[PDB]
Symmetry: D2
């Protein structure tokens, strides 16, 4: 048996855009992501799958059923977001010098919050209250995240930007978005603080800027290929996180963290340890050193307005990245980690998921302990999961990763929960519905939810607060012989 | 949901030779099967795997744990056998004309039973009582089967017979074995009737004679290739069943049936329906017409001593057989049913097990309804299961077959239980330990039992007496795309 | 036996950018494609493989060896191109109103050619002459193609355009490229007509416009996603074809054709035949009806477009399966070029190292459809398979050659079969990993090796037939031993 | 380039029972093997495939075509056998005490040969003469083998023996077979010495005894499982070899050898070298030490066994991996001949249609070990692969031929390489599905087709070398595109 602390919580994470739509009356056409996935040119190019979010699992209407199953499964924590676009579907009054690079302060007071309240959609606000009240009534501790990728269209027209036209609303390329996100986050905290246990500002900002402006084959908006603009978006999102932290703290005493996309960097050969360190710098430390230590590049400076804006770290983990040394520095290798063939085996002989992601649970131990040792901030594992409609690998994937969290705690790391991605299948961005990450399988025709055998396994874990002796054998690699190569 | 009658029982089947040994003090070296699997020439030839039963899951010593898990899983029925060899390890007094073809009667009375009792091993008898009492204490209804393949060595030296020497104990080739089996069965019923709910005489006699004397590549004892001797063994086993039925009835009022190896015969093309009928005659009806209607070939005769010796039919089902018409009659086709490649796909694109057996749950409906329509005797599904260490396919296999039993009942067939093969992994005959059929995985080093996710699924079924709405999606074919081709 | 007419020739096709570089001294940095595959951002995005064409098979230096092997293989025809960038690496003085949509005429004469002559790189001109003379000396009939995708950088800066900046050299989006292309083509014919047997203006203009401005995941320059700009590019390249035809004919009496990317459109179900016809309209007929019948949409007849084609080069690899929809028709993934690599299609047919389905019947379909609509003679200017191991190529080669025999048998005038390609080469955005050669290239030494399919092709070419002994290869590669 | 000595010959091997039947008039029902594969019980058991050799490739009728193709392929050597059953289909009068264990001498002279002559089938004798003369006329050096597994039914009724009945004709279990074999072999040399270049007494006697009486799942006659009878069979066949050697030498001065089944024994870990040596003793040295040095266990020296060998025929397909145990050593499944069909071994190496691992290094190992122990010259009398598709064969062929070049380079006297086989044939208990031919056979028409490997072998044989152009095929077939 592997037993967890009495205060440790098992649960799940979910995003608004991916799960909300699907039931009558739930449609939210007012984001960049919505327009992006409906775009005829994006469709013809194959940048997006052609599946549409309004045909989704319908959490907007069916949230009670989701919660009923989560309670039956013994879950005790949930992390969800509000969609910015549903609360402010129309523009707010121009407030502030758009040409200044830095946003060091955003003043928000009771009077400004009351003005904002005049513009907010009240049906959306009341619906979210009805969702969150139900959530809390099933004994789920609630982490509220402010942002999980889609921006209101009045803040970002991604097609115009894809086209190389920067005269319109330009998303994370504009400090206006930074200013409005701060106000939005303070506002949400102001409205929902009675229901919330902890806050996250953002989900995976590094993915927003990285796939948006560099990894353009991923079909993430605005899909404009530019190193320079990727840096500018990342700079703005960092200061937005900081301003949102101050904003929430102005109305709440509760903890405020951030959720980030992690990979475990692994050396190809024993001569590649430095390459790993450089990769960890370039992908992880530079970001967290900005929002914790205020250290940033603009020249290399310390900003007092950035320093100390973080109470906890949300660790999103799926797989590793294998790196090797170069003359220039380091490179990541194809055929390991997230760059494998789908339903196959990596160059290391480890099985890959429906998404082509390599099975590597040890990497979670690596990531949790590395964060712990650098910053000594407590963490939650805010995402971990696998694309697997058949449920062949998921029982092993779940048990193995949960075990590595037990290992991290054992070594001294403060980790207070594990939240699987996800409770149910949902709309996987540019890939559409084909990538199924749910403990529960969704029939998209009826919206019925089904317990995959992994869900029964998770229920064993959660109800016992332990990997029990009876399922401990799942702490292993799925046998590769009967799977596709 | 698919709900079963309130009186319907879900459970499991297990064989003594396959599961008993493994714990200190459990060794039974006194069968033909034991000698067969230890034989140096059989090993060198690869007729047997080289694995040995004395390294097995240890039900002899660990039965309480097996039963504890079966109770936790909500099971309510079990079918097990006594090993003849453990009760009578030494020969009994010659009793009876060995040259007579037919055995129409075997007189057994109280006095003869008391004499037999002088020769029986009392430690073995008391141990089996301790096993069965525990079984009954977990609320399991008990089907006691008399015979599941291994014969005492004093009745069969399979190596001598393999060598073409018929001067020694010749197993089912001798009417002495028929006479002794009758006495053995009456004796066991006489000793255990207070603990038993229903009786089976034999498990799969058609396999004993078919693999023993025709399908010699299977490495079943005595492995002597002879159409003529296969017919003689089958003739003797039929009359043995009949004499055992009379013997048990002499001491018990309880129901007495038999368990038989079934395949669903399927036509290659729509012009092959007659081929199916001929296959059903040659593999199924000829046998059951003998022991129910007394009809047999010796010339084609009716034996009053055979007629009506059957209260119920145990249906063992794994997969189909595809047949086509010939000039001579019919032939079965490779690449379907049990003749596929391991961990692959059949010629019909259906996934195959670790044993190379094709996924075909519809065949169970075929078999149950065919039996029902011919004889109108109630049945139990006494075996159904899959070789699958990884547990990839078993969740689908279990749910799908259980569904087909619901279908058969719905159509009017009297089916009173479903017994999975098996509760735990065990020694799979000539194949050894590599073929794992358990709901529970066995670690053969420690003898610890582990719940595969299919076991959690079975528990849902059994505790609810239904395929619940939540697991109903498993009533489908395992997706082939992520599995080996 | 399947015997071809005595005049039928077997040979091969190759492209300058794909095969020329690799030997020191061969480097041509002056194209949009060179810049495109060296671009840091494109590399980081994975739009290009990171492989570089200067590490190629080195036809520039080693052409004599290529030709030696082709002769040993019994080949009697070759289609190659000159690279525009090599001949005119520096910008030409502006000549002509750039805002006019149509380019109906480009005046070229002796004096204008002599002027152009003074900008041309003479080292490049003499080298091509040396390559083509050696070609001719090995008995190879010569189809000279003017254009196989790279443009001089002075006509197209693809990174600027990718970035959404239209103030620079804009490639096929500008009538200046049309004008200069007409002049380039007249100029090359003027210099090389003594060596050339037939001309092609261009290779697969449909792919240039289609992957350049719509299929942007393919990493083709300039990778600017726009239906409107895709139409404009195609409009320009059509008129460039016509002006190039007139330009060549002003200096030569030899046949002038075009090489085009074809797929065989096949119905998913028997209820999808109309979808096939719509697909053929949208992908094939619209284009050829423009340059043959002058019919275009801008729906009019342009007399400067009409009749500008003597022959049709058919490039064929695989099929495309289509179904009817409400709005029209869609192509289906899991068939044709949209399959998993080294696997099988949704129909159970084997796929190549590139994920393309084995479907040789499609070639018969494409040849006979063209023949029945236009009655212009054809060459199969490309057909081949990405297959480093050589597992499928023997079957692929014999099966497709058989379909050409079928086409001829049914009445179609097909005059040659040119395999893609003689040796491995640089496969555009995919780099070197896609190996189409009858000959394998060791890129470290530039040595060529005969894959067994080359021995099989020698049998066909030397005999002018699929011989009795290799006739079994007219079948699908057995899928059981291959990856699924 | 890898050039062979000028005297080195490339060719092929084939067996009478596997290749002769198929043409009407060729049927030979008089062997144990014929009876064995027609047996109803064996068929029902799956011990034999159900395929029948009378539906074969038809070398009996079509030998001229086989030879025509072999000549076109540049082959200069052939090893075949006469079928005993064809020459003596009826029982010979009993001659000699059958209960004596040793057969140290068999007296054969002119008069005894003339007597035998009166029992011989003359139609069969003349037909073989016609086949061998046509062979010789195509420039093929001729190795005549006396025995390649089938015995006349009058010497072995395999079904009787399978059933455990030892009162009938018992094949290699009886010294009568030894006696008659010596006489048969002297007789054939007597009739055919004018046509023959070198002799082999027998093909793979280790397999006859080993699969016949131990590996009974292989479906080899008589399939009676007995360690003791396996030893007795092997003892008899050894002395039959020796008596056959003396018999041939009484009528001929030509070289007399033996063809044997080899595997290259390889250690699982570096701690398994002793296991390899024990494996080589138990599978190879014990046998050759008997017929070369007269050393045998009955542990003595037999002067009638000593020195009865001029040359060694090495049959090689794959390796066997072994490990040390307490009791000795064991062979490991997942390597060598014990792999899954059309997949990869535990070492990641591709396997054939028969499940045999690609391991050409083993041939170098086997050739040099023999050479170093005995210093007798060798021929590679079999090497090939079950591969209907021809995916692996080009690599298999070139790689193994290279290892022969390696062996010669290191000093071993190897004089030829004979591929198994020229055309597909009847693969014993497996039937026709295992196709080893350089030429594919259509069994419906008996037509032969050149797989691309045949074109590759023509390159090797005609040049007497692995040429520069095919040298890349000296490598492992890429596993990525193949089934796993
Ligand atoms: O891929 C599954 C999830 N993975 C994620 N990060 O890796 C995203 O936060 C989430 O929205 C889903 O995309
Ligand atoms: O193959 C699994 C089981 N199958 C059986 N019949 O098919 C036997 O009764 C049982 O003992 C096990 O062999
Ligand atoms: O893909 C192989 C070839 N195929 C082509 N068209 O499909 C191009 O003309 C040629 O340049 C190569 O890309
Ligand atoms: O397996 C291919 C050949 N291999 C053989 N030995 O391994 C036999 O000599 C020959 O008759 C064929 O069986």
């Amino acid at each position: 048996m592997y037993s967890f602390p009495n205060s440790f919580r098992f649960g799940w994470s979910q995003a608004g855009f991916q799960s909300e739509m699907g039931t009558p009356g739930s449609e939210d056409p007012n984001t960049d992501w919505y327009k992006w996935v409906h775009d005829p040119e994006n469709m013809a190019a194959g940048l997006v799958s052609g599946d549409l979010p309004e045909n989704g699992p319908g959490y907007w209407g069916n949230y009670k059923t989701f919660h009923d199953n989560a309670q039956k499964m013994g879950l005790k924590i949930a992390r969800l977001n509000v969609e910015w676009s549903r609360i402010f579907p129309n523009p707010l009054p121009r407030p502030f010098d758009e040409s200044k690079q830095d946003v060091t302060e955003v003043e928000i007071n009771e009077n400004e919050l009351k003005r904002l309240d005049e513009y907010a959609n009240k049906d959306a606000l009341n619906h979210y209250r009805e969702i969150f009240k139900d959530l809390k009534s099933r004994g789920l501790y609630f982490i509220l995240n402010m942002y999980h990728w889609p921006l209101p269209l009045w803040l970002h027209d991604p097609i115009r930007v894809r086209r190389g036209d920067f005269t319109g609303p330009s998303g994370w390329l504009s400090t206006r978005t930074v200013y409005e996100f701060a106000r939005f986050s303070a506002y949400i905290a102001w409205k929902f603080d009675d229901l919330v246990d902890e806050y996250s500002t953002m989900n995976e900002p590094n993915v927003v800027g990285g796939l948006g402006y560099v990894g353009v084959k991923s079909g993430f908006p605005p899909g404009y290929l530019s190193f320079e603009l990727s840096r500018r978006a990342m700079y703005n999102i960092i200061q937005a996180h900081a301003r949102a932290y101050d904003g929430i703290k102005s109305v709440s005493k509760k903890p405020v963290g951030i959720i980030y996309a992690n990979s475990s960097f692994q050396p190809l050969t024993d001569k590649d340890m430095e390459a790993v360190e450089m990769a960890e710098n370039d992908n992880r430390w530079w970001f967290f050193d900005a929002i914790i230590r205020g250290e940033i590049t603009r020249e290399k400076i310390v900003r007092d307005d950035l320093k100390g804006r973080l109470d906890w770290i949300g660790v999103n983990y799926y797989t590793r990245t294998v790196v090797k040394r170069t003359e220039k520095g380091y490179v990541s290798l194809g055929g390991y980690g997230h760059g494998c063939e789908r339903n196959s085996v990596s160059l290391a002989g480890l099985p890959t998921s429906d998404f082509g992601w390599e099975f590597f649970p040890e990497g979670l131990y690596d990531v949790l302990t590395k964060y712990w040792n650098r910053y000594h901030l407590y963490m939650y594992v805010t995402e971990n999961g696998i694309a697997d409609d058949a449920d062949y690998q998921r029982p092993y994937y779940l048990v193995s990763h949960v075990y590595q969290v037990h290992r991290a705690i054992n070594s001294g790391a403060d980790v207070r929960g594990y939240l699987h991605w996800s409770l149910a299948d949902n709309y996987e961005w540019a890939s559409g519905f084909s990538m199924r990450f749910g403990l529960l399988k969704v029939d998209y025709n009826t919206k019925r939810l089904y317990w995959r055998p992994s869900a029964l396994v998770y229920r064993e874990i959660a109800t016992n607060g332990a990997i029990t002796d009876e399922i401990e054998h799942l702490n292993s690699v799925p046998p590769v012989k009967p799977l596709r190569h």
